[PDB]
Amino acid sequence: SFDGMFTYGMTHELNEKIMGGRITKIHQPYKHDVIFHIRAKGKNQKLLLSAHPSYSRVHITAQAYENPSEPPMFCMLLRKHIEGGFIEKIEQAGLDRIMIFHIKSRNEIGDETVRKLYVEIMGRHSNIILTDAAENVIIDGLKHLSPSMNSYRTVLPGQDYKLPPAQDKISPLEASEDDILRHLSFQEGRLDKQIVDHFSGVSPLFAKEAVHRAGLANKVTLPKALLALFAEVKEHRFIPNITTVNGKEYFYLLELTHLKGEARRFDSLSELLDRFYFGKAERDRVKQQAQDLERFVVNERKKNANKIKKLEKTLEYSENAKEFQLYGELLTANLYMLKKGDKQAEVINYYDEESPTITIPLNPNKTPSENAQAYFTKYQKAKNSVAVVEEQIRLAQEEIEYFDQLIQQLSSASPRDISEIREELVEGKYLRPHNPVLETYESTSGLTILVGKNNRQNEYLTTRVAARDDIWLHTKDIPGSHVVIRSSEPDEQTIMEAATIAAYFSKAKDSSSVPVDYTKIRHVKKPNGAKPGFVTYDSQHTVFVTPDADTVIKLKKS
Amino acid sequence: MLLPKRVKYRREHRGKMRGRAKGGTEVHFGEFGIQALEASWITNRQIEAARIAMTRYMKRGGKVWIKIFPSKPYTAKPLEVRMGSGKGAPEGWVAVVKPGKVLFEISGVSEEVAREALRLASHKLPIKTKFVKREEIG
RNA sequence: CCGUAAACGGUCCUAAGGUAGCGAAAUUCCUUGUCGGGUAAGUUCCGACCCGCACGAAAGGCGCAACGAUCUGGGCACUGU
RNA sequence: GCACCUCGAUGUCGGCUCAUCGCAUCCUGGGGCUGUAGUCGGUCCCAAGGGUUGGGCUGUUCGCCCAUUAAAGCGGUACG
RNA sequence: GGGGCCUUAGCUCAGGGGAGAGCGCCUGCUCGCAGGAGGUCAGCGGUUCGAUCCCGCUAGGCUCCACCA
RNA sequence: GGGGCCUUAGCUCAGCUGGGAGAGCGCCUGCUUUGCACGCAGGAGGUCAGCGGUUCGAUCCCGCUAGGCUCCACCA
């Protein structure tokens, strides 16, 4: 993955791309992602420094990281200390996953003092720490750590910065083959793990790729393959690509011979990291910002399912109550003797020619007639239950359909979209408490495509925005986004592209050839008094599309 | 809850209640009504209580005509203070009701429904009441 | 004043906005603050939390053996209190 | 609230001692209605005859708590 | 409870002829620029031709008192 | 004695005026993490203080029993 060799390649690319330059804007739109607006030679650049627990990365992004919320205090101190300055050089601290940024920043009083910004990408131990490069005390850190919790390398403002524990490994690059083979000491076959815990900044993916490039593991066969790979990495020779075998993805700066799969080679690492985290980063963000809403909706869906099962239990208690009513009628037609303490009295069949075995009803000590009358009352309550529980089952399936749709719209939604879901639910009273912005796309033929991600956006889009003869698209019998094309005539290619966008923004995102329907927006209506977000339609046409991400990324307008 | 939304003066003299009713003596909108026999200030809270007490028991029937309106404000000095040092703040609104005046008017129901509704209204009022009806000489 | 997890960031104002050490105090209205000890029961007392209306460094701050016809709590013995 | 009596003096809180009076009655006595099965209860009558506690905290009345009791009643008498 | 000062952009504050800064968000331009979203100027009602600007009141936020038996 | 608010997982607490029980901390299971006790999903735990009435379902509405805070006046 983004190992020491990858950092070596990332430092080389950043030295090639952003040399000198000016950091005009510093934005921190999320908890772990920091955006630097580098004005380098030529055009503007957008450097991303991410310290996610699983998705931490450093690359030059190109998409628009929207929702610039109110900035946290680390971002404010970055704009106080770093903005207006220049970048001297970008170098790596050896072969470990440590990024050093040399910032020639002018101070706020007018003079110049160089600042060193340290970026560490260690998975869940990732952090961004800024030092003043003369005394090397920590001015601020992205994650603040205590002297007790993570006692080594305490990150506090004013505390002298300390480096991450040494791994006790040799430098893998420029290392002689003799050196490399005089310390791994292969005995029983832990080869990849030996490369991992003996060789600086090596992912297990590079070890498993090296043991496949060696072919048959051997005393000299393995070492020669590893030396060749390290020499290529040092020569800056890189072939960035994306390979996968089933669904879950992998990326590297070198071509993969092992774990053969669909291999999508990239031009540079910037487009590679833009295409890779394109879905995962967005998914981990609306999950981390709206976990309470989705937890509430899933819990309420479980409540409704348990409610339906316990209502079907009362629907069986309906048939149970009829037998009790019949027993009460039999007791009534015979209650003229043995009134005192009446129970297990044999009853002669009053109905049918069956003459079924004498029954022996047991009654409590109220009155011989009030027990049969109590049975008859239970029967009246049972038939009123037959009415009301069927009404409640109908309401519960309507609620489950709406909540499954809300799960779908929250699962495929962006930061702003999930917040708009929040507002919608609080309005619904479900959550205890103006021409909005939407998402737009441009087709191949220049036709504008509007996609509504939330039901509050969807009802406004369907009833205010789009005019007549606009083709409206939705996935057949599966919840999805509502896609409308604002042109009088839709080209077949436009319809295909909008159907792929609607299939991508659906519950069938990880499906193939998912059904989609398209019709004019004049043919959609909604009932009054029902749940909002319910749109029904008639006279529609069906086409089959495959929800691939490439087409959606290509069709962006912004 | 009846009150004027704007007044010419917020503080007025309390006035006098001598003599009979100047107007509103005869029932001429509804069929039955309450005729006042004594004079006192009627607070709009009492008017609201009497109106709800009539309207609830007349859930099916005609509307109620409220012939009195609390146009005169009364001032209430805050408690535990010395006498004088300026007139106090206005607290509420009362209607100056003289004997002989018609208070509430009902038409469109039966006789006993109207009598019981007027009795329930009269038990909320601070004045002696009587039952009157329209006279057609005429 | 407003945020952000003492400390840092934005703004007004001044000469500058309380450092160390103490803290419900001979200082705390709320208030008999909360917890624990002591008693069967403790608006007093003791030890901590800071939530210090309105502690604070020679109008000195925090501790301190010995000392006091000093003040405030708790025990043994002793008794007509 | 007012300032009628007292500024050529009407000693003001809380306790101790001694009490007395009115029930709008805390218990004890006699009853009605109870959604009063019995015990225990709830509400409203008639009834002042008698009795209505020992402590910890705080100057405290009051109040909280401990242990009882048939109950640990409200007030007036220059807040006796 | 009684005097005095304010309620103005998301935050902090200036301010009878029709109202603004710094920070927070954008816009193209390679340590600074020239522009835009957001203002019931806390609300009501009177004087005139118009009120943030003058006034009588309601809620709110600070400051000083609430003493003698 | 007089009014009010609550008793909900081991702990701190929401649950909108009856439509079918949860957040955080806490205890386990599995994944992941080169490394600094920095991550994720999935499980339990509740007769909603105890009992019995109402209706088709009651923490919610009702009656009857255990409990805890508030709320009540001095004074010279």
JSON list of C-alpha atoms in Angstrom, two decimals, chain B residues 40-123:
[
{"chain": "B", "resi": 40, "resn": "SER", "atom": "CA", "xyz": [-69.88, 45.17, 39.05]},
{"chain": "B", "resi": 41, "resn": "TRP", "atom": "CA", "xyz": [-66.82, 44.95, 36.83]},
{"chain": "B", "resi": 42, "resn": "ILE", "atom": "CA", "xyz": [-66.79, 41.83, 34.66]},
{"chain": "B", "resi": 43, "resn": "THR", "atom": "CA", "xyz": [-63.29, 40.57, 33.86]},
{"chain": "B", "resi": 44, "resn": "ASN", "atom": "CA", "xyz": [-62.65, 39.07, 30.40]},
{"chain": "B", "resi": 45, "resn": "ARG", "atom": "CA", "xyz": [-61.57, 35.84, 32.15]},
{"chain": "B", "resi": 46, "resn": "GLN", "atom": "CA", "xyz": [-65.12, 35.52, 33.52]},
{"chain": "B", "resi": 47, "resn": "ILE", "atom": "CA", "xyz": [-66.51, 36.29, 30.05]},
{"chain": "B", "resi": 48, "resn": "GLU", "atom": "CA", "xyz": [-64.32, 33.54, 28.58]},
{"chain": "B", "resi": 49, "resn": "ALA", "atom": "CA", "xyz": [-65.40, 31.09, 31.31]},
{"chain": "B", "resi": 50, "resn": "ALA", "atom": "CA", "xyz": [-69.10, 31.82, 30.70]},
{"chain": "B", "resi": 51, "resn": "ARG", "atom": "CA", "xyz": [-68.64, 31.55, 26.92]},
{"chain": "B", "resi": 52, "resn": "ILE", "atom": "CA", "xyz": [-66.90, 28.16, 27.15]},
{"chain": "B", "resi": 53, "resn": "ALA", "atom": "CA", "xyz": [-69.56, 26.96, 29.62]},
{"chain": "B", "resi": 54, "resn": "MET", "atom": "CA", "xyz": [-72.34, 27.88, 27.17]},
{"chain": "B", "resi": 55, "resn": "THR", "atom": "CA", "xyz": [-70.51, 26.67, 24.04]},
{"chain": "B", "resi": 56, "resn": "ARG", "atom": "CA", "xyz": [-69.60, 23.26, 25.47]},
{"chain": "B", "resi": 57, "resn": "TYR", "atom": "CA", "xyz": [-73.19, 22.39, 26.40]},
{"chain": "B", "resi": 58, "resn": "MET", "atom": "CA", "xyz": [-74.37, 23.80, 23.04]},
{"chain": "B", "resi": 59, "resn": "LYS", "atom": "CA", "xyz": [-72.01, 21.63, 20.93]},
{"chain": "B", "resi": 60, "resn": "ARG", "atom": "CA", "xyz": [-74.81, 21.48, 18.34]},
{"chain": "B", "resi": 61, "resn": "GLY", "atom": "CA", "xyz": [-76.66, 24.75, 17.88]},
{"chain": "B", "resi": 62, "resn": "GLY", "atom": "CA", "xyz": [-76.32, 28.41, 17.03]},
{"chain": "B", "resi": 63, "resn": "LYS", "atom": "CA", "xyz": [-73.60, 30.89, 17.85]},
{"chain": "B", "resi": 64, "resn": "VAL", "atom": "CA", "xyz": [-73.19, 33.06, 20.94]},
{"chain": "B", "resi": 65, "resn": "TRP", "atom": "CA", "xyz": [-73.43, 36.86, 20.80]},
{"chain": "B", "resi": 66, "resn": "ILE", "atom": "CA", "xyz": [-71.25, 38.51, 23.44]},
{"chain": "B", "resi": 67, "resn": "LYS", "atom": "CA", "xyz": [-72.92, 41.87, 24.05]},
{"chain": "B", "resi": 68, "resn": "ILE", "atom": "CA", "xyz": [-70.28, 43.20, 26.48]},
{"chain": "B", "resi": 69, "resn": "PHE", "atom": "CA", "xyz": [-66.65, 44.03, 25.73]},
{"chain": "B", "resi": 70, "resn": "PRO", "atom": "CA", "xyz": [-63.84, 44.69, 28.28]},
{"chain": "B", "resi": 71, "resn": "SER", "atom": "CA", "xyz": [-62.72, 48.08, 26.99]},
{"chain": "B", "resi": 72, "resn": "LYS", "atom": "CA", "xyz": [-61.82, 49.69, 30.33]},
{"chain": "B", "resi": 73, "resn": "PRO", "atom": "CA", "xyz": [-58.41, 48.75, 31.78]},
{"chain": "B", "resi": 74, "resn": "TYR", "atom": "CA", "xyz": [-57.63, 48.60, 35.48]},
{"chain": "B", "resi": 75, "resn": "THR", "atom": "CA", "xyz": [-54.23, 49.33, 36.98]},
{"chain": "B", "resi": 76, "resn": "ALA", "atom": "CA", "xyz": [-52.59, 47.19, 39.65]},
{"chain": "B", "resi": 77, "resn": "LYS", "atom": "CA", "xyz": [-49.71, 48.56, 41.71]},
{"chain": "B", "resi": 78, "resn": "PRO", "atom": "CA", "xyz": [-47.06, 45.91, 42.51]},
{"chain": "B", "resi": 79, "resn": "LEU", "atom": "CA", "xyz": [-47.29, 44.30, 45.92]},
{"chain": "B", "resi": 80, "resn": "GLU", "atom": "CA", "xyz": [-45.34, 45.16, 49.11]},
{"chain": "B", "resi": 81, "resn": "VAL", "atom": "CA", "xyz": [-44.69, 48.80, 48.11]},
{"chain": "B", "resi": 82, "resn": "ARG", "atom": "CA", "xyz": [-45.58, 52.06, 49.83]},
{"chain": "B", "resi": 83, "resn": "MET", "atom": "CA", "xyz": [-48.60, 54.13, 48.88]},
{"chain": "B", "resi": 84, "resn": "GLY", "atom": "CA", "xyz": [-48.23, 56.69, 46.11]},
{"chain": "B", "resi": 85, "resn": "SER", "atom": "CA", "xyz": [-45.09, 57.29, 44.00]},
{"chain": "B", "resi": 86, "resn": "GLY", "atom": "CA", "xyz": [-47.03, 57.10, 40.73]},
{"chain": "B", "resi": 87, "resn": "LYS", "atom": "CA", "xyz": [-49.91, 55.07, 39.36]},
{"chain": "B", "resi": 88, "resn": "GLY", "atom": "CA", "xyz": [-49.23, 51.37, 38.86]},
{"chain": "B", "resi": 89, "resn": "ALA", "atom": "CA", "xyz": [-49.12, 49.29, 35.68]},
{"chain": "B", "resi": 90, "resn": "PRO", "atom": "CA", "xyz": [-52.32, 48.11, 33.94]},
{"chain": "B", "resi": 91, "resn": "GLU", "atom": "CA", "xyz": [-53.12, 44.47, 34.69]},
{"chain": "B", "resi": 92, "resn": "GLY", "atom": "CA", "xyz": [-56.34, 43.50, 32.93]},
{"chain": "B", "resi": 93, "resn": "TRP", "atom": "CA", "xyz": [-59.53, 44.58, 31.20]},
{"chain": "B", "resi": 94, "resn": "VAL", "atom": "CA", "xyz": [-63.07, 44.79, 32.58]},
{"chain": "B", "resi": 95, "resn": "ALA", "atom": "CA", "xyz": [-66.47, 45.72, 31.18]},
{"chain": "B", "resi": 96, "resn": "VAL", "atom": "CA", "xyz": [-68.66, 48.18, 33.08]},
{"chain": "B", "resi": 97, "resn": "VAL", "atom": "CA", "xyz": [-72.01, 46.38, 33.39]},
{"chain": "B", "resi": 98, "resn": "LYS", "atom": "CA", "xyz": [-75.10, 48.13, 34.79]},
{"chain": "B", "resi": 99, "resn": "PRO", "atom": "CA", "xyz": [-78.36, 46.47, 35.91]},
{"chain": "B", "resi": 100, "resn": "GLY", "atom": "CA", "xyz": [-80.77, 45.75, 33.08]},
{"chain": "B", "resi": 101, "resn": "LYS", "atom": "CA", "xyz": [-78.01, 45.07, 30.53]},
{"chain": "B", "resi": 102, "resn": "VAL", "atom": "CA", "xyz": [-78.05, 41.99, 28.30]},
{"chain": "B", "resi": 103, "resn": "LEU", "atom": "CA", "xyz": [-74.78, 40.06, 28.58]},
{"chain": "B", "resi": 104, "resn": "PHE", "atom": "CA", "xyz": [-74.96, 37.02, 26.26]},
{"chain": "B", "resi": 105, "resn": "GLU", "atom": "CA", "xyz": [-77.45, 36.14, 23.52]},
{"chain": "B", "resi": 106, "resn": "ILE", "atom": "CA", "xyz": [-78.53, 32.68, 22.32]},
{"chain": "B", "resi": 107, "resn": "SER", "atom": "CA", "xyz": [-80.78, 31.67, 19.43]},
{"chain": "B", "resi": 108, "resn": "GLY", "atom": "CA", "xyz": [-81.28, 28.44, 17.52]},
{"chain": "B", "resi": 109, "resn": "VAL", "atom": "CA", "xyz": [-81.71, 25.91, 20.35]},
{"chain": "B", "resi": 110, "resn": "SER", "atom": "CA", "xyz": [-84.53, 24.60, 22.52]},
{"chain": "B", "resi": 111, "resn": "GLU", "atom": "CA", "xyz": [-85.93, 26.29, 25.61]},
{"chain": "B", "resi": 112, "resn": "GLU", "atom": "CA", "xyz": [-84.41, 24.07, 28.31]},
{"chain": "B", "resi": 113, "resn": "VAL", "atom": "CA", "xyz": [-81.01, 23.87, 26.56]},
{"chain": "B", "resi": 114, "resn": "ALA", "atom": "CA", "xyz": [-80.89, 27.68, 26.54]},
{"chain": "B", "resi": 115, "resn": "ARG", "atom": "CA", "xyz": [-82.02, 27.89, 30.19]},
{"chain": "B", "resi": 116, "resn": "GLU", "atom": "CA", "xyz": [-79.37, 25.40, 31.36]},
{"chain": "B", "resi": 117, "resn": "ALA", "atom": "CA", "xyz": [-76.65, 27.11, 29.29]},
{"chain": "B", "resi": 118, "resn": "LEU", "atom": "CA", "xyz": [-77.59, 30.49, 30.78]},
{"chain": "B", "resi": 119, "resn": "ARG", "atom": "CA", "xyz": [-77.59, 28.97, 34.28]},
{"chain": "B", "resi": 120, "resn": "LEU", "atom": "CA", "xyz": [-74.10, 27.57, 33.68]},
{"chain": "B", "resi": 121, "resn": "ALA", "atom": "CA", "xyz": [-72.99, 30.99, 32.42]},
{"chain": "B", "resi": 122, "resn": "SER", "atom": "CA", "xyz": [-74.63, 32.76, 35.37]},
{"chain": "B", "resi": 123, "resn": "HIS", "atom": "CA", "xyz": [-72.86, 30.55, 37.92]}
]
